[PDB]
Design a protein around this ligand. Structure first.
Ligand SMILES: CO[C@@]1(C)C[C@@](C)(O)[C@H](O)[C@@H](/C=C\C(C)=C\C[C@H]2O[C@@H](C)[C@H](NC(=O)/C=C\[C@@H](C)OC(C)=O)C[C@@H]2C)O1
Ligand SMILES: [Zn+2]
Ligand SMILES: [Zn+2]
Ligand SMILES: [Zn+2]
Lengths: 110, 144, 62, 325, 187, 66, 81
RNA sequence: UGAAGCUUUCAUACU
């Protein structure tokens, strides 16, 4: 547990100097919402150097039960027109999506 | 949308895969292929491995349509189930004494190799050095 | 010699007895035999002699 | 606008005739004081509680980051010929001026230098000291370096030539620092290993045990044995004459130390030989489990060595880790 | 210039994977080594069969593919309920008997202290009373001769278990002489 | 058949093994953190490990049979 | 039967007859990635022609979603010869 | 207990 009064997470460490966490979902609604965010951001905001996002996370084995939150937080850096096109499919506004993204991060990490 | 309905059609596909009629097995293989490519990234690997256990014995089939459907189903399972399982199914036949088994298994292996050549790096089994040649990959044995 | 999958397609006697000797040596080797494989240090000197087997320890403690 | 409560919790509301955004962070039991400051040359609010936080978005990157100091009671921006951009902060029986000059980082770090590549460290449960093992390939030990240098000196003094001007006494005096000029990478099966006891609050080295030339440490553990009292022990697994490519090793050893003086000193007890590299050591039910290459063994503490108690021989290739629940 | 079966069985670390034709391969040592990898299901076993695959016996008569329990409970065979069909399909969903990755299917592989209430009703045994002694007729031999050595941990009411135990059709209980909660799960 | 690394019913052990050794070395050259692992393990510069792998590319597994 | 020479910038086309079905797996469901063809197959009088029946092209040729998932869009010019 | 393959002048069904 990283923050006082927070929840337990799985912290990992990398040979390039990176630090990351994997946190569990507690409800089906959060999981479904983040799954739809990832699905819609895989198409309308593709990786910069020509890679397929689902194929990259399936490099040696297919992905199973993980949502890429580094792709999901790239929503806050898109242009307002595409932010609206993405948000209006989730039946939501961009500020609500931003608040929902910040909630799960501040629940576990900083 | 099919991710919620794979458990319901599995016994029917079992029965059809056990059916003597060529169309029954060919069409069941087509169903397996479409189901595999339909659910991908949704965690349905259990039923798909179960169904592969019934699809695989048909690799020694001479009828062209049946073997075409079997190859399609195998290439769909390569995506839905992963290349590691496919390599595990091909390993013991790659070097069989009979030329028929070797032909079939090398066709399947080449199909697995052309797609996802990079993932196979992490899946190859260990092969020991002989007197003449070195076969161990030593870098992967490093321990920081 | 018991009938197992190891002794299949083997039709000659001496081949069977030699393969049985081989399998016996292999299996007997790969087990854990505590009697000869164990390190006891008896309280005879209590700070020396850790080369005691599992039988010499009983002889010293008898 | 920001809303500070009398507790260590905060609110936020975007300026408009009606609230449009909401975000509350449980980040105190003491009243929040909101003060004006300027970070990055633009506006920011320095919230203050038992701990003092800085709230700043950053091109839509909201950050509520604490600081590495204790409670204050009033502050604002500062500017001088000394430093034109800072803060004037007040504490109990104190008048401070402070500054924050880190461009949006999440961690602050302090560093303590080591000698070789660290492999693994354990934490002493009583003293909270760290027991680290460091090991490098193509490396000399300290003694081997010293004697190799003395060798080169005595050989260059007998170069058969006027024996009248000595570069050898100048070559022996000052050692160029290895953190700047590199360590002499010499040899293919040559190793260098070290065991270190370190205090984590300060950076001081409490104890240092150097090992022989071609011994390489790979595992370390701190535990207690049931047949003994409440004494702590340190076990170090070491390879002997390891070649990596093609792989070849001459053997291995397990060292045992007693970890006395409130977890500050290691004293050698004995040294048990093994026929392969001990790569994993794990305390287990008043005893210890050791992975000796392909073999998994149970070991109890003895008076002259470690006593083998149980063994499994069916693990596939090589044991790289052991964990027990 | 080719091995015999017994000669090749002496060279390999695992002789029970060696077969008749394995000595006729171009590289039998690699073949046997790959046959011993700690994975890698074997060949479909009908490569040498001249009867091809499947077929073989038309003797067996098979009934129509039985519908799953919940679907057959939906009462499909006029007023139709949709919510019942939905809630039942999702809420009543069950997982069928799946098989392991190693397992393979063959032509002949589709054929090869507590008592039930129906057996207790047919045998003529009454129900368990509140505070009395109503043993089964096999318990008198256990009370006379002693406890069974095959199951020493079994408890019977009257001999080892007290009479007030016995509840319903449970006339016996096996008494054999942590933090088991999973880590990340939905609430 | 036109792709390098594919096999057939007459492929030998040597060709298979040198093919997987060669694309293993290329994969090591490609992935940035595998080369890091090796360069930390054997205590060498990364340029030196790259050059060693390129030099090993020529004849991995020794010269062929007969 | 496929040209399969490494392609370039020319955009493959389909005729009115089959508009909207994949060129690899000839499928009627979900198109994904635009088809590129070799320069020789688009040279001269061949520009804009159907990648299946060399007739007049009226729409852009696409690989289906299943083909792009299996990376069957990376195998070369799919003009049928 | 079991092993039902191969061929055509058959004849009959499905694509
Ligand atoms: C005779 O000409 C051919 C055979 C060759 C050709 C390429 O030259 C010609 O253009 C082509 C055109 C007509 C036909 C019959 C081919 C394609 C179409 O066929 C139809 C018969 C199917 N019907 C369906 O798709 C079923 C459902 C519907 C509504 O779709 C969808 C998406 O739900 C599949 C396909 C849409 O057919
Ligand atoms: Zn072309
Ligand atoms: Zn056309
Ligand atoms: Zn297609």
């Amino acid at each position: 547990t990283l923050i006082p009064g927070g929840s337990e997470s799985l912290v990992y460490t990398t040979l390039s100097g990176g630090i990351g966490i994997l946190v569990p979902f507690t409800s089906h609604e959060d999981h479904d919402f983040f799954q739809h965010v990832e699905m819609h951001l895989r198409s309308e905001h593709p990786p910069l150097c020509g890679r397929d996002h689902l194929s990259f996370r399936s490099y040696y084995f297919p992905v199973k039960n993980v949502i890429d939150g580094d792709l999901c937080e790239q929503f806050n850096s898109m242009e307002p027109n595409k932010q609206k096109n993405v948000s209006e499919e989730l039946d939501r506004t961009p500020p609500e999506v931003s608040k929902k993204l910040e909630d799960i991060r501040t629940r576990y990490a900083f | 949308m099919g991710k919620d309905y794979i458990y319901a059609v599995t016994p029917l596909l079992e029965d059809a895969l056990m059916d003597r009629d060529l169309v029954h097995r060919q069409t069941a293989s087509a169903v397996v292929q479409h189901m595999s490519l339909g659910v991908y990234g949704f965690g349905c690997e259990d039923s798909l491995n179960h169904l592969l256990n019934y699809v695989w014995p048909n690799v020694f089939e001479t009828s062209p349509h049946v073997i075409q459907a079997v190859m399609g189903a195998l290439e769909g399972l390569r995506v839905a189930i992963g290349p590691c399982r496919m390599l595990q199914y091909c390993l013991q036949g790659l070097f069989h004494p009979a030329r028929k088994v070797r032909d079939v298994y090398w066709k399947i292996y080449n199909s697995i190799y052309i797609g996802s050549q990079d993932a196979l790096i992490a899946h190859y089994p260990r092969i020991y050095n002989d007197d003449k040649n070195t076969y161990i990959r030593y870098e992967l044995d490093y321990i920081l | 010699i018991p009938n197992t999958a190891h002794f299949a397609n083997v039709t000659q006697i001496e081949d069977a007895v030699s393969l049985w000797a081989k399998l016996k040596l292999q299996k007997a080797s790969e087990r854990w035999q505590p009697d000869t494989e164990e390190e006891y240090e008896d309280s005879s000197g209590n700070v020396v002699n850790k080369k005691t087997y599992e039988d010499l320890k009983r002889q010293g403690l008898l | 606008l920001n809303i500070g409560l009398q507790n260590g919790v905060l609110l936020r509301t975007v300026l408009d005739p009606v609230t449009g955004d909401l975000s509350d962070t449980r980040t105190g039991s003491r009243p929040v004081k909101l003060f004006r400051v300027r970070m990055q040359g633009q506006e920011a609010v320095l919230a203050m509680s038992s701990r003092s936080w800085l709230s700043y978005s950053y091109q839509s990157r909201f950050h509520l980051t604490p600081l590495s100091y204790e409670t204050l009671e009033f502050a604002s921006g500062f500017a001088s010929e000394q430093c034109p951009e800072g803060i004037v902060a007040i504490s109990t029986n104190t008048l401070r001026i402070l500054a924050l000059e880190k461009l949006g980082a999440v961690f602050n770090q302090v560093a303590f230098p080591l000698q070789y590549t660290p492999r693994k460290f354990v934490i002493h449960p009583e003293s909270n000291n760290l027991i680290i093992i460091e090991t490098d390939h193509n490396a000399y030990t300290e003694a081997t370096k010293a004697q190799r240098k003395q060798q080169m000196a005595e050989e260059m003094v007998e170069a058969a030539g006027e024996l009248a001007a000595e570069m050898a006494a100048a070559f022996l005096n000052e050692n160029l620092p290895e953190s700047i000029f590199g360590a002499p990478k010499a040899g293919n099966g040559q190793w260098a290993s070290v065991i270190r006891v370190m205090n984590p609050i300060q950076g001081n080295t409490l104890d240092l045990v150097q090992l022989e030339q071609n011994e390489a440490a790979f595992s370390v553990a701190v535990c207690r044995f049931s047949n003994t009292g409440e004494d702590w022990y340190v076990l170090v697994g070491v390879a002997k004459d390891l070649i990596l490519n093609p792989r070849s090793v001459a053997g291995g050893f397990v060292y045992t130390y007693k970890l006395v003086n409130n977890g500050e000193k290691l004293e050698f007890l004995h040294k048990t030989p093994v026929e392969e590299v001990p790569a994993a050591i794990a305390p287990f039910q008043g005893r210890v489990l050791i992975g000796v290459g392909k073999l998994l063994r149970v070991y109890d503490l003895g008076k002259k060595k470690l006593l083998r108690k149980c063994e499994n021989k069916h693990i596939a290739n090589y044991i790289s880790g052991i964990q027990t629940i | 210039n080719r091995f015999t079966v017994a000669e090749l069985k002496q060279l390999v670390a695992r002789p029970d994977v060696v077969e008749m034709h394995d000595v006729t391969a171009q590289d039998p040592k690699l073949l046997v080594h790959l046959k011993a990898t700690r994975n890698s299901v074997p060949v479909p076993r009908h490569w040498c069969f001249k009867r091809k695959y499947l077929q073989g016996k038309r003797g067996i008569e098979k009934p129509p593919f039985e519908l799953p329990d919940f679907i057959k409970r939906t009462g499909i065979q006029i007023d139709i309920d949709y919510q019942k069909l939905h809630d039942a399909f999702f809420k009543w969903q069950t997982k069928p008997k799946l098989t392991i990755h190693g397992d393979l299917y063959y032509e002949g592989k589709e054929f090869e202290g507590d008592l039930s209430d129906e057996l207790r009703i047919s045998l003529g045994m009454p129900v368990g009373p509140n505070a009395h002694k109503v043993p089964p007729p096999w318990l008198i031999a256990m009370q006379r001769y002693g406890p069974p050595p095959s199951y020493p941990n079994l408890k019977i009411p009257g001999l080892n278990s007290p009479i007030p135990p016995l509840y319903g059709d449970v006339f016996g209980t096996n008494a054999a002489e942590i933090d088991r909660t999973p880590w990340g799960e939905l609430e | 058949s036109k792709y390098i690394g594919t096999g057939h019913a007459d492929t030998t052990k040597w060709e298979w093994l040198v093919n997987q050794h060669r694309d293993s070395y290329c994969s090591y050259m490609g992935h940035f953190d595998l080369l890091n692992y090796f360069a930390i393990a054997e205590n060498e510069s990364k340029a030196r490990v790259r050059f060693n792998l390129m030099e090993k590319m020529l004849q991995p597994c020794g010269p062929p049979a007969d | 039967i496929f040209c399969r020479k490494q392609a370039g910038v020319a955009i493959g086309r389909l005729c009115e007859k089959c508009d909207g079905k994949c060129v690899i797996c000839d499928s009627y469901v979900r198109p994904c990635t635009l088809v590129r063809i070799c320069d020789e197959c688009n040279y001269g009088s061949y520009q804009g022609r159907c990648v299946i029946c060399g007739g007049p092209g009226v729409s852009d040729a696409y690989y289906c979603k299943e083909c792009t998932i299996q990376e069957k869009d990376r195998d070369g010019c799919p003009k049928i010869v």
